[PDB]
Amino acid sequence: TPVLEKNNVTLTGGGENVTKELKDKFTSGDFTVVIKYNQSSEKGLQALFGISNSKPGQQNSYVDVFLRDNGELGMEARDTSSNKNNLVSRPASVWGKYKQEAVTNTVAVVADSVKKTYSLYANGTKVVEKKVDNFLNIKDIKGIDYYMLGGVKRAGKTAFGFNGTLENIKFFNSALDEETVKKMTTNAVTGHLIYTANDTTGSNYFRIPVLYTFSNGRVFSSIDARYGGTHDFLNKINIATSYSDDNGKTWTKPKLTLAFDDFAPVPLEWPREVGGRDLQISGGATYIDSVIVEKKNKQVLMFADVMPAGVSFREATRKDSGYKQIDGNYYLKLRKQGDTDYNYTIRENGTVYDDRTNRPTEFSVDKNFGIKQNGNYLTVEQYSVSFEKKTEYRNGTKVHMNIFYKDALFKVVPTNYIAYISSNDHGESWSAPTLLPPIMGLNRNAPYLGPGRGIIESSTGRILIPSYTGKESAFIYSDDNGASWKVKVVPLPSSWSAEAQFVELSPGVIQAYMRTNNGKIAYLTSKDAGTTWSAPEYLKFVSNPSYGTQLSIINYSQLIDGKKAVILSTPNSTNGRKHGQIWIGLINDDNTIDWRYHHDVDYSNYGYSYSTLTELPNHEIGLMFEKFDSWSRNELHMKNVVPYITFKIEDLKKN
Ligand SMILES: CC(=O)N[C@H]1[C@H]([C@H](O)[C@H](O)CO)OC(C(=O)O)=C[C@@H]1O
């Protein structure tokens, strides 16, 4: 039970003195403080409460919990005369605003002198726990004599003044246990996660959300389940999915849809300290960066990049497709252990052929890229990961030997591929993966997918899938309803990571909106359903760092102000992946777009990285996004940071 509980304390920087109420309550010196609050203004560093020695000379003798204007939650515990200064925090811990209202958050700190740890909670997640050698509790700090809500009294003056309402605050004179505080901090914000740390996927981390609405009214999601922290590479990554049959109100428990089992789908506590955060899982095959489209016959397609163990965007050979052409057919090539050349091909029925004799061997490759010998699977030992400093070790479980694995008898060229799977039941079940043929040419690697959706161009029925090479756009398309694939390769002005998404403006007229390396969003126009493309133009109202970020843009089915509309989601800040905005663009008779409305998702300094939009069956808009800066090295390996939210068009008109 609490030693003090206060309510509805509204403050504009001035604080409230609770010294009488708390002096003498903290007999051990340990504490837990649970704060339900909303901010009226996010600017500046703000303390939810402060326990201090307030006398002259003692300004570095206090304990607080604080909020920053970027959503970071932290705590300090400091003592002047011993020059001890503890700081524990996690970025991207709270929400600011949502549809014009201050968001209620619930945060907590626990100081446990027996464990010498400080822990912080926010909205049902333990965002950080840190053992510190210079531990300080209230009793360790010399001359504590002032206890304040909404500030810290330093040398007779209020510092870090809070602006908002403390809805409820509880002080306890002991360290409460993990499960209790998680539960006390659960609130509405907790319910915005579709994918959560250590859910059914077994992953602690997620990136790259995709939302898509099927013609039956199902709203479908996919995501990268990233097991070895949030690194793009090297990593062990599966694609997970989850769906809603009620306009997004409730979602299925995630399922694994594309996954390799050379490593198991198990939760790892990836180190966030500078000394460990660069660590990667290096020996494991992966699927990464998903694209969803629904065909006109209602079959659903999902594409993803395929990385063999040890391969990524960084390491993949650019000068080999991994295919060989033999008698006009293209066959995936293989190198056998102990050979220097690639002497083998996978041909009809998955039969592995020795290219030197042009005869079938006793080996074959199954529909999931697993290897058999005389009809029986070959196996290898699965890896697990251990920390103490990281080890990847053989764990004694047998999985099928696979051509994408580190320990295979036959291996593919160490480059990146694309695979696609199809579903005839709106994503309850999926075919085995098909690898894309060497559409870029035999002597070039596959392109890299632009995460989000593809489209069906309405006048031709052409299926378009966005991708990029690092130097060109690669618009993968089919003119036979997905039976065969070709590509339009478009050289770009510079080395853009050209993650793109399409809209259709009018029949036969499409635009590709994409990331660049120059700070702007580019759009290229085709008036022949993607066969030829204009020179790039640039949006004038978004200004981002040079590296860029993925965007989402969709067609919307309903008129807005009497006009056909598109809806765009992007960060908009030169300071980082921040300041999420949703823009409404109304299409004019002449196919120019009037970018008439924008909505700021949260405050400007709050994190906003990869995103995905979909129109719900009821004509509201669903948004999932990375609510953190996914470029920053300081925001790596964070749990429960990819929420789902919804807007009415009337919400999006405001800002
Ligand atoms: C396949 C892959 O690596 N995709 C990643 C992509 C890529 O590395 C970059 O575009 C190279 O320039 O970058 C990012 C990113 O947050 O910036 C995330 C993607 O998942």
Local structure of residue 605 (DSSP, 8 states): T
Residue 469 Cβ contacting ligand 1 at under 6 Å: no
Q: Are residues 298 and 397 in the same domain?
A: no
Q: How many Cα atoms are found within 13 Å in the side-chain-facing hemisphere of 252?
A: 17
Residue 388 tokens, joined: 């103490």
Residue 286 tokens, joined: 């992966």
- Distance, in Å, from the CA atom of 500 to the CA atom of 585, rounded to the nearest integer, reads 17
Residue 34 tokens, joined: 């649970």
Q: Are residues 567 and 497 in the same domain?
A: yes
- Distance, in Å, from the CA atom of 80 to the CA atom of 373, rounded to the nearest integer, reads 71
- Distance, in Å, from the CA atom of 427 to the CA atom of 241, rounded to the nearest integer, reads 9
Position 19, amino acid? T
Q: How far is the CA of 348 from the centre of ligand 1 (A)?
A: 34
Residue 588 tokens, joined: 């004019």
Q: Look at strands 537-538 and 522-526 and give their pairing.
A: antiparallel
- Distance, in Å, from the CA atom of 190 to the CA atom of 180, rounded to the nearest integer, reads 15
Per the CB < 8 A criterion, the answer to whether 321 and 443 are in contact is yes
Partnered with residue 566 across adjacent β-strands are 555, 585
Per the CB < 8 A criterion, the answer to whether 160 and 152 are in contact is yes
Residue 113 tokens, joined: 């002198």
CA distances from 65 to 40, 41, 74, 267, 525 (A): 17, 17, 6, 29, 51
| CB neighbour list of residue 271: distance below 8 Å, 6 or more residues apart | 277, 279, 387, 637
Per the CB < 8 A criterion, the answer to whether 313 and 234 are in contact is no
CA angle 510, 515, 516 (to 5 degrees): 115
Pick left, alpha or beta for residue 245 (phi over 0 → left; psi -120 to 50 → alpha; otherwise beta): alpha
Residue 233 Cβ contacting ligand 1 at under 6 Å: yes
Q: How far is the CA of 468 from the centre of ligand 1 (A)?
A: 11
User: Which of 653, 500, 467, 466 is closest to 567 using CA atoms?
Assistant: 653
Helix segments in 491-545, DSSP class H: none
Q: Look at strands 286-294 and 452-453 and give their pairing.
A: parallel
Q: Which atom of ligand 1 is nearest to the CA of 630?
A: 16
Residue 448 Cβ contacting ligand 1 at under 6 Å: yes
Pick left, alpha or beta for residue 340 (phi over 0 → left; psi -120 to 50 → alpha; otherwise beta): alpha
Residue 606 Cβ contacting ligand 1 at under 6 Å: no
| Residue 547 falls in the annotated catalytic set | no
Secondary structure of the chain: what % helix, strand, coil (to 5)? 5, 45, 50
Q: How far is the CA of 447 from the centre of ligand 1 (A)?
A: 12
- Distance, in Å, from the CA atom of 36 to the CA atom of 185, rounded to the nearest integer, reads 8
Residue 440 tokens, joined: 């870029």
- Distance, in Å, from the CA atom of 281 to the CA atom of 487, rounded to the nearest integer, reads 33
SS3 178: helix
Q: Are residues 99 and 186 in the same domain?
A: yes
Q: Are residues 479 and 572 in the same domain?
A: yes
- Distance, in Å, from the CA atom of 562 to the CA atom of 548, rounded to the nearest integer, reads 33
Residue 320 tokens, joined: 């080999």
Measured from the Cβ of residue 358, the count of other Cβ atoms closer than 10 Å reads 10
SS3 563: strand
Residue 484 tokens, joined: 């065969």
Q: How far is the CA of 203 from the centre of ligand 1 (A)?
A: 19
User: Which of 652, 611, 651, 653 is closest to 628 using CA atoms?
Assistant: 611
SS3 67: strand
Position 644, amino acid? Y
Per the CB < 8 A criterion, the answer to whether 475 and 530 are in contact is yes
b/e map of 540-578 (b: 16 or more CB within 10 Å)? Answer: eebebbeebbbbbbbbbeeebeeebbbbbbbbbbeebbb
CA distances from 109 to 30, 36, 48, 147, 637 (A): 11, 12, 11, 16, 21
- Distance, in Å, from the CA atom of 373 to the CA atom of 356, rounded to the nearest integer, reads 19
CATH number of residue 106's parent domain: 2.60.120.200
| Residue 42 falls in the annotated catalytic set | no
- Distance, in Å, from the CA atom of 408 to the CA atom of 182, rounded to the nearest integer, reads 44
Task: Supply φ then ψ for residue 626, to 5 degrees.
Answer: -85, 110
Residue 313 Cβ contacting ligand 1 at under 6 Å: yes
Per the CB < 8 A criterion, the answer to whether 37 and 11 are in contact is no
Measured from the Cβ of residue 383, the count of other Cβ atoms closer than 10 Å reads 24
Last residue of a domain, one of 398, 414, 430: 414
Residue 630 Cβ contacting ligand 1 at under 6 Å: yes
- Distance, in Å, from the CA atom of 642 to the CA atom of 387, rounded to the nearest integer, reads 26
Task: Supply φ then ψ for residue 19, to 5 degrees.
Answer: -65, -55
Residue 640 tokens, joined: 């429960």
Q: How far is the CA of 232 from the centre of ligand 1 (A)?
A: 6
Residue 48 tokens, joined: 């939810």
- Placement of tokens 């399409």 in the chain: 502
Catalytic, out of 610, 626, 629, 635: 610
Sheet-wide strand order for 4-12: 4-12, 163-172, 31-39, 105-112, 117-122, 125-131
Q: How far is the CA of 209 from the centre of ligand 1 (A)?
A: 13
CA angle 327, 330, 331 (to 5 degrees): 105
Pick left, alpha or beta for residue 301 (phi over 0 → left; psi -120 to 50 → alpha; otherwise beta): beta
- Placement of tokens 């196996």 in the chain: 379
Catalytic, out of 112, 232, 261, 472: 232
Nearest CA, atom 5, ligand 1: 232
Task: Supply φ then ψ for residue 189, to 5 degrees.
Answer: -65, -40
For residue 234, is the peptide bond before it cis, meaning its omega torsion is within 30 degrees of 0? yes
Structural resolution in Å: 2.1
Last residue of a domain, one of 414, 446, 471: 414
User: Which of 501, 612, 502, 615 is closest to 560 using CA atoms?
Assistant: 615
Q: Are residues 243 and 278 in the same domain?
A: yes
User: Which of 473, 505, 58, 430 is closest to 259 using CA atoms?
Assistant: 430
Per the CB < 8 A criterion, the answer to whether 324 and 443 are in contact is no
Residue 289 Cβ contacting ligand 1 at under 6 Å: yes
- Placement of tokens 């196919």 in the chain: 591
DSSP symbols for 285-326: -EEEEEEEEE-TTS-EEEEEEEE-TT--TTT--SS--SEEEE
Residue 63 Cβ contacting ligand 1 at under 6 Å: no
Q: Are residues 202 and 155 in the same domain?
A: no
Task: Supply φ then ψ for residue 40, to 5 degrees.
Answer: -90, -25
Residue 288 Cβ contacting ligand 1 at under 6 Å: yes
Catalytic, out of 42, 224, 261, 499: 499
Q: How far is the CA of 66 from the centre of ligand 1 (A)?
A: 33
| CB neighbour list of residue 460: distance below 8 Å, 6 or more residues apart | 479, 508, 529
- Placement of tokens 């080395």 in the chain: 495
| Residue 610 falls in the annotated catalytic set | yes
- Taking the CA atoms of 95, 98, 102 and 105 in sequence, report the sign of the dihedral they define: negative
The beta strand positions in 370-494, using DSSP E, are 371-373, 376-377, 379-387, 390-400, 410-411, 417-423, 434-435, 448-449, 452-453, 455-456, 463-468, 472-478, 486-491
Q: How far is the CA of 22 from the centre of ligand 1 (A)?
A: 51
Position 636, amino acid? L
Residue 212 tokens, joined: 């898509």
Q: Look at strands 300-307 and 323-326 and give their pairing.
A: unpaired
Where in the sequence is the domain holding 24, given as residue range(s)?
Answer: 1-190
- Taking the CA atoms of 186, 187, 189 and 192 in sequence, report the sign of the dihedral they define: positive
CATH number of residue 431's parent domain: 2.120.10.10
Nearest CA, atom 14, ligand 1: 232
Q: Are residues 76 and 186 in the same domain?
A: yes
Q: Are residues 452 and 487 in the same domain?
A: yes
Q: Are residues 64 and 150 in the same domain?
A: yes
Total number of domains in the chain: 3
Pocket probe mutation, ligand 1, options 205, 311, 313, 578, max atoms within 8 Å of Cβ: 313
Per the CB < 8 A criterion, the answer to whether 401 and 379 are in contact is yes
User: Which of 152, 151, 162 is closest to 40 using CA atoms?
Assistant: 162
Q: Which atom of ligand 1 is nearest to the CA of 289?
A: 20
Q: Which helix (H) or strand (E) holds 578?
A: none
- Distance, in Å, from the CA atom of 635 to the CA atom of 640, rounded to the nearest integer, reads 12
Q: Are residues 475 and 590 in the same domain?
A: yes
- Distance, in Å, from the CA atom of 290 to the CA atom of 634, rounded to the nearest integer, reads 26
- Distance, in Å, from the CA atom of 337 to the CA atom of 201, rounded to the nearest integer, reads 33
User: Which of 91, 75, 48 is closest to 137 using CA atoms?
Assistant: 75
- Distance, in Å, from the CA atom of 137 to the CA atom of 118, rounded to the nearest integer, reads 10
Q: Are residues 88 and 225 in the same domain?
A: no
**Environment class of residue 650 by beta-carbon count within 10 Å: exposed (0-12), middle (13-18) or buried (19+)?**
exposed
Per the CB < 8 A criterion, the answer to whether 66 and 51 are in contact is no
- Distance, in Å, from the CA atom of 508 to the CA atom of 462, rounded to the nearest integer, reads 10
Q: Are residues 289 and 430 in the same domain?
A: yes
Q: How many Cα atoms are found within 13 Å in the side-chain-facing hemisphere of 543?
A: 5
| CB neighbour list of residue 51: distance below 8 Å, 6 or more residues apart | 22, 62, 63, 64, 138, 144, 146, 147, 148
SS3 140: helix
Last residue of a domain, one of 363, 398, 414: 414
Residue 594 tokens, joined: 């009037």
Residues in the chain: 655
Residue 629 Cβ contacting ligand 1 at under 6 Å: no
- Taking the CA atoms of 177, 36, 634 and 190 in sequence, report the sign of the dihedral they define: positive
